[PDB]
Amino acid sequence: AEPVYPDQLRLFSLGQGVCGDKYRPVNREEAQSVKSNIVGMMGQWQISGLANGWVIMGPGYNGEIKPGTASNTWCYPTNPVTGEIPTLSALDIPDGDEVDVQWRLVHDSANFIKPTSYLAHYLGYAWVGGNHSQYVGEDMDVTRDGDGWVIRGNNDGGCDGYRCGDKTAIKVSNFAYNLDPDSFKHGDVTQSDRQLVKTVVGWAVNDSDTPQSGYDVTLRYDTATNWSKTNTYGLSEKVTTKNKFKWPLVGETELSIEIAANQSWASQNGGSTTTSLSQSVRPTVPARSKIPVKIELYKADISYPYEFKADVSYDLTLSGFLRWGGNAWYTHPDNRPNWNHTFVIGPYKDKASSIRYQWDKRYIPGEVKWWDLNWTIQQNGLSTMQNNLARVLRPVRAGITGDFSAESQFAGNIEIGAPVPLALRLEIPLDAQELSGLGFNNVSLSVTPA
Amino acid sequence: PVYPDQLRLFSLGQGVCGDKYRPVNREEAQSVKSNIVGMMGQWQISGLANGWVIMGPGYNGEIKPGTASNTWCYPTNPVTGEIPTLSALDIPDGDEVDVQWRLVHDSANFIKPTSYLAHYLGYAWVGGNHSQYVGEDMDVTRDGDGWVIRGNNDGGCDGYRCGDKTAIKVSNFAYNLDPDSFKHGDVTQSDRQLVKTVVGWAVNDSDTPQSGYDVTLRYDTATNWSKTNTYGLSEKVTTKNKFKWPLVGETELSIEIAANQSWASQNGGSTTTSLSQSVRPTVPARSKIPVKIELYKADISYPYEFKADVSYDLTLSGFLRWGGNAWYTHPDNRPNWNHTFVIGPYKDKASSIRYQWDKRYIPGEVKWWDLNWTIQQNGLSTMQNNLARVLRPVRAGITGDFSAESQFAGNIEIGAPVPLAGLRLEIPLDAQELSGLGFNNVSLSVTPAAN
């Protein structure tokens, strides 16, 4: 309600202080109210407008809010959807075997069993608890189900209530883990150093009576990169990454490691590869003069414990019968029908399985084709639903660890010194054999117009 | 390369961009999906080239065919070769004197890059008499709390005024601890345990069901915590904005770190915060409902680590060369020259290399150094790889041990209604007992939802 929702802001390019159909300019106070969020949605040196001649700058300008004018405007809806589900801080589960990472999440009474149970209960699912308790989400048994788990109330002994024997089950299945490359952190560097294995030197001469410029002196060469990694546990066998990425750089050791996408993290533990590389400068040597040029070749290796975060997602399927005269299905059946509905807890898939969608579009009558979330609100009130939904939708991440080590060869910049006279050709010796013995193959120096 | 910071959303109709801009295509959109989605509303839908669309974070940034009257665009003629943001240059924590010494003497990560910056900008003799190259045979001397990197001047040299070595002064250091870089070791202690269950009843002595009253639980909790600081640098680190101590395990901690205070002067204590749980139950006519409130105790400890970003001022003193320098006026009188940069978060245009470089193509902006001249003198590549080194983020590890104990209540739970043999409450609370277990000023109240 009252509070401004960052994720509902929309930008317009309609001129100063102008908004599109059914949007109004965001004012200073509101902007300040969620400063971090607006800035995080802006470009480096972006500058957008706010109400009554004010402006908010991007991260580059330190997201500052001051008087000003902008052609574009941060606008808010004249009819904003109220009572958003908050997004709680991530629940970080330490690295372990898939089974253990999953037990830790699934049997957590306060962060999983109770919220998901209460969600099912709020949706009108009957008997969401075991007969050892009168409260929902208690005396809940967690049992293995393939690569998933099932959560149903213990059914030992007898129970009171019509069909109390038919306990609703909460199926947690279809798990997935997406390693986030940006979450990269590393411990103390075990090994680290970069030797100067050789330095190529010589000169670059200018013969003509006119200043030689606009030519690129380019060094091309090959070297091998040897890296390897370990995986402390087995969850590794199931994590992938949306897209390929370059292993992050640490120290002064230039590496060229490409982790491949959608390929088991546990299946990519290292490799030896020779990579063609290059370096180049565009000198400007004055008439009939020469410049000293130097290229330092290096060798570096580094080792360290590493850690990434994998975003966990799973399917939440609720199955049981819908309570009589207390139901949230849109048709509000009264025949206590056996029911099955699955929510995708993680990356969006479709409307039917998106709690956040059905919640946010709850006031658009034509969109409610599944759970009538409005019912949960008259039944429980805004705060209770918001707090509960936030708990079931809380992001879950799993740590991914192990040791990393690598060694590679590479050249530094082609450096040049103060030009010397005399009274664009190169005189830079390249000992093929010594270089080859050092691990630098197919090394060449070329001159080519800019 | 599609540079995300040059992207621009326009609201001018189907596939329409602003002047000198063009529609982002499906592929280009995929190459920078996260940056685009990170600028979009939860359920925003925006257009791309040839009738495609990219959706907001809520739809998981799906890229698919669709019609949209607002569009993601890119310059037809983009400012090319933006300075690459390299990975962080980690520095071994220690006492302030250590981190500075380690930074300042780093030949390949600081001396060479800052010396080349001066040289490319036209500063003369940025090198020692014992080398023909820029940035070699340099001497670093103190000058208060600031440092000075300048070519060795001993012996004899050649060149007009070769005795005038350009000095690179580093001063005014500052270290900003980044709360999001949080990480921890083995959580050498943990768990939660139930220490008491406060139970009672809500009764309804009416012939009609009751749903108009909030039962709320209010109380004070004290978190007894602490944290050590392995090294001395922490005496100078601060945080721009306050933050909640990060949640680890399942011990709810109510700890806050204040901005503008030395990291080292916030090592723990007993902090009291007032919490409040509530619920609006529905009690059938002539009925009562059991109310349950569990109270927990929790202990946690573990080594911790946050990184502190290091910023400093880089001042270049020397005279600008004869045949060309970078100053927008391009003097030739071979003048002494003082100019300082701010290596770290923005401050102002004059002292921001990133700013002058990114806006180089805008004539009115070049009021200091024009980096278009340096690019025509050394090539586009040379210059962005050099500025990539100069602006390479530098950070020191801030480590130590963290320990904490706290008491917290679970949510208020409601049982099944059972026929009695404004909503009313009957739940005993013994101030002294509760207090013995770390819960003070505990109250259960029944309030109409209409207040």
Which H, E and C letters describe A174-216, residue by residue?
Answer: EEEEEEEEEEEEECCCCEEEEEEEEEEEEEEECCCCCCECCEE
| β-bridge mates for residue B420, sequence order | none
Residue in chain A nearest B353 by alpha carbon: A60
Q: Please list every residue in chain B whose beta carbon sits closer than 8 Å to the beta carbon of residue A248.
A: 87
CATH superfamily assigned to domain B89-174+309-395: Proaerolysin, chain A, domain 2 (3.30.412.10)
Give the separation between CA B373 and CA A284, rounded to whole angstroms: 14
Per the CB < 8 Å rule, is B133 touching A9?
no
In the block, residue with structure tokens 């780093």: B106
What DSSP character marks residue A341? E
- Residue B436 CB contacts under 8 Å (≥ 6 apart), including other chains: none
Pairing verdict, β A289-321 and A415-416: antiparallel
Per the CB < 8 Å rule, is B346 touching A294?
no
Retrieve residue A414's tokens: 């082609």
Option in A10, A356, A418 nearest B41 (CB): A10
By residue count, chain B amounts to: 451
Give the separation between CA A198 and CA A276, rounded to whole angstroms: 18
The helix/strand count (H/E) of chain B reads as 8, 23
Q: Where are the beta strands (DSSP E) in B320-416?
A: 336-343, 394-409, 413-414
How close, in Å, is residue A217 to chain B by CA atoms?
12
Q: First and final CA of chain A: distance in angstroms? A: 60
Option in B60, B132, B187 nearest A418 (CB): B132
Q: Tell me if B89 sits within 8 A of B392, measured CB to CB.
A: yes
Per the CB < 8 Å rule, is B134 touching A281?
no
Query: CA A234, A240, A242: angle at the middle one, nearest 5?
Result: 165
Retrieve residue B160's tokens: 């007009």
Retrieve residue A159's tokens: 């129970």
Retrieve residue A34's tokens: 């969620």
Instruction: List where CATH 2.170.15.10 sits in chain B.
Output: 175-308+396-451
Retrieve residue B383's tokens: 């210059």
Q: Tell me if A265 sits within 8 A of A242, measured CB to CB.
A: no
Written as one letter, the residue type at A364 is I
Residues 204-223 of B with CB under 8 A from A: none
Q: What is the largest CA-CA distance in chain A?
A: 109
| β-bridge mates for residue B192, sequence order | B298
Spell out the alpha helix ranges (H) of A381-442: 382-392, 432-438
Secondary structure class of A242 (helix, strand, coil): coil
Q: Please list every residue in chain A whose beta carbon sits closer than 8 Å to the beta carbon of residue B354.
A: 60
Give the separation between CA B70 and CA B17, rounded to whole angstroms: 8
Pairing verdict, β B237-238 and B167-184: parallel
Written as one letter, the residue type at B111 is I
Burial A146-159 (b: 16+ CB within 10 A, else e): eebbbbbbebeeeb
How big, in percent rounded to 5, are the helix, strand and coil portions of chain A?
20, 40, 40
What experimental approach yielded this model? Answer: X-ray
Give the separation between CA B449 and CA B147, rounded to whole angstroms: 65
Secondary structure class of A342 (helix, strand, coil): strand
Secondary structure class of A244 (helix, strand, coil): coil
Residues 71-110 of A with CB under 8 A from B: 89, 92, 94, 108, 110
Which CATH architecture does the domain made up of B1-88 adopt? Roll (3.10)
Q: Tell me if B395 sits within 8 A of B90, measured CB to CB.
A: yes
Main-chain dihedrals φ then ψ at residue A6, nearest 5 degrees: -40, -45
How close, in Å, is residue B252 to chain A by CA atoms?
11
Per the CB < 8 Å rule, is B415 touching A185?
no
Retrieve residue B238's tokens: 């601060």
Q: Does domain A1-90 have CATH number 3.10.40.10?
A: yes
Give the separation between CA B309 and CA B345, rounded to whole angstroms: 10
Option in A135, A252, A384 nearest B415 (CB): A135
Q: Would you put residue A258 in left (φ > 0), alpha (ψ -120 to 50) or beta?
A: beta
Q: Tell me if A328 sits within 8 A of A318, measured CB to CB.
A: no
Give the separation between CA A425 and CA A204, rounded to whole angstroms: 6
What DSSP character marks residue A353? G
By residue count, chain A amounts to: 450
Option in A13, A61, A136 nearest B12 (CB): A13
Instruction: List where CATH 3.30.412.10 sits in chain B.
Output: 89-174+309-395
The helix/strand count (H/E) of chain A reads as 8, 25
Output the CA torsion A411→A412→A413→A417 (10° steps). Answer: -110
In the block, residue with structure tokens 């050099």: B386
How many whole angstroms from its chain centre is CA A411?
33
Q: How many CB atoms lie within 10 A of CB B290?
A: 17
A352 touches chain B (CB under 8 A): no
Written as one letter, the residue type at B295 is L
Give the separation between CA A235 and CA A397, rounded to whole angstroms: 12
In the block, residue with structure tokens 């945080």: B239
Domain A177-310+398-450 falls in which CATH fold?
Answer: Proaerolysin; Chain A, domain 3 (2.170.15)
Main-chain dihedrals φ then ψ at residue B61, nearest 5 degrees: 45, 30
A342 touches chain B (CB under 8 A): no
Option in A248, A252, A379 nearest B109 (CB): A252
Burial class of residue A262 (count of CB atoms within 10 Å of its CB; 0-12, 13-18, 19+): exposed
Q: How far lies A395's CA from each of A168, A170, A347, B13, B182, in Å?
A: 24, 19, 10, 36, 17
Q: Tell me if A194 sits within 8 A of A252, measured CB to CB.
A: yes
Residue in chain B nearest A45 by alpha carbon: B5
In the block, residue with structure tokens 């290292």: A270
Size of interface A-B (CB pairs under 8 A): 117
Output the CA torsion A313→A319→A325→A331 (10° steps). Answer: 70
Instruction: List where CATH 3.10.40.10 sits in chain B.
Output: 1-88
Q: How many CB atoms lie within 10 A of CB B136?
A: 19
Give the separation between CA A343 and CA A353, rounded to whole angstroms: 4
Q: How many CB atoms lie within 10 A of CB B393?
A: 16
How close, in Å, is residue B92 to chain A by CA atoms?
9
Spell out the alpha helix ranges (H) of A51-165: 98-106, 114-122
Q: How far lies A124's CA from each of A85, A107, A128, B446, in Å?
A: 20, 23, 10, 26
Residue in chain A nearest B279 by alpha carbon: A384
Instruction: List where CATH 2.170.15.10 sits in chain A.
Output: 177-310+398-450
Give the separation between CA A111 and CA A116, rounded to whole angstroms: 9
- Residue B250 CB contacts under 8 Å (≥ 6 apart), including other chains: A108, A110, A111, B190, B191, B192, B298
In the block, residue with structure tokens 């400012």: B79
Main-chain dihedrals φ then ψ at residue A231, nearest 5 degrees: -130, 110
Main-chain dihedrals φ then ψ at residue A175, nearest 5 degrees: -70, 150
| β-bridge mates for residue B170, sequence order | B147, B314
Burial class of residue B165 (count of CB atoms within 10 Å of its CB; 0-12, 13-18, 19+): buried
- Residue A146 CB contacts under 8 Å (≥ 6 apart), including other chains: A173
Give the separation between CA A31 and CA A48, rounded to whole angstroms: 11
Pairing verdict, β B89-91 and B394-409: parallel
Residue of B21, B413, B414 to mutate, testing the A interface (most A Cβ within 10 Å of its Cβ) = B413
Query: CA A14, A17, A20: angle at the middle one, nearest 5?
Result: 45
Written as one letter, the residue type at B395 is R
How many whole angstroms from its chain centre is CA B351?
21
Q: Tell me if B225 sits within 8 A of B405, measured CB to CB.
A: yes
| β-bridge mates for residue A270, sequence order | A228
Written as one letter, the residue type at A240 is T
For residue B397, how many C-alpha atoms fall within 13 Å in the half-sphere facing its CB?
Answer: 18
Q: Tell me if B272 sits within 8 A of B291, measured CB to CB.
A: no
Give the separation between CA A2 and CA A17, rounded to whole angstroms: 22
A155 touches chain B (CB under 8 A): no
Per the CB < 8 Å rule, is A61 touching B133?
no
Q: Tell me if A44 sits within 8 A of A59, measured CB to CB.
A: yes
Domain A91-176+311-397 falls in which CATH fold?
Answer: Proaerolysin; Chain A, domain 2 (3.30.412)
Spell out the alpha helix ranges (H) of B343-438: 353-358, 371-378, 380-390, 431-436
Burial A296-317 (b: 16+ CB within 10 A, else e): bbbbbbbebbbbbbbbbbbbbb
Q: How far lies A447's CA from each of A410, A430, B375, B376, in Å?
A: 20, 15, 19, 18
- Residue A412 CB contacts under 8 Å (≥ 6 apart), including other chains: A279, A295, A296, A297, A298, B108
Give the separation between CA B120 and CA B107, rounded to whole angstroms: 18
Retrieve residue B286's tokens: 């002539």
Burial class of residue B193 (count of CB atoms within 10 Å of its CB; 0-12, 13-18, 19+): exposed
Pairing verdict, β A191-205 and A10-12: unpaired
Domain spanning B175-308+396-451, CATH class: mainly beta
Secondary structure class of A376 (helix, strand, coil): helix
Q: How far lies B346's CA from each of A64, A352, B361, in Å?
A: 11, 46, 20
Retrieve residue B354's tokens: 């990133």
Written as one letter, the residue type at A162 is Y
Per the CB < 8 Å rule, is B58 touching A384?
no
In the block, residue with structure tokens 């209540």: B409
Q: First and final CA of chain B: distance in angstroms? A: 58
Q: Which are the residues after which chain B is interrupted (C to N > 2.5 Å)? A: 421
Containing B31, the helix (H) or strand (E) segment is: helix B26-31
In the block, residue with structure tokens 């799993």: A398
How close, in Å, is residue B328 to chain A by CA atoms?
21
Give the separation between CA B405 and CA B408, rounded to whole angstroms: 10
Cα-only R_g, chain A? 31
Retrieve residue B191's tokens: 């768990």
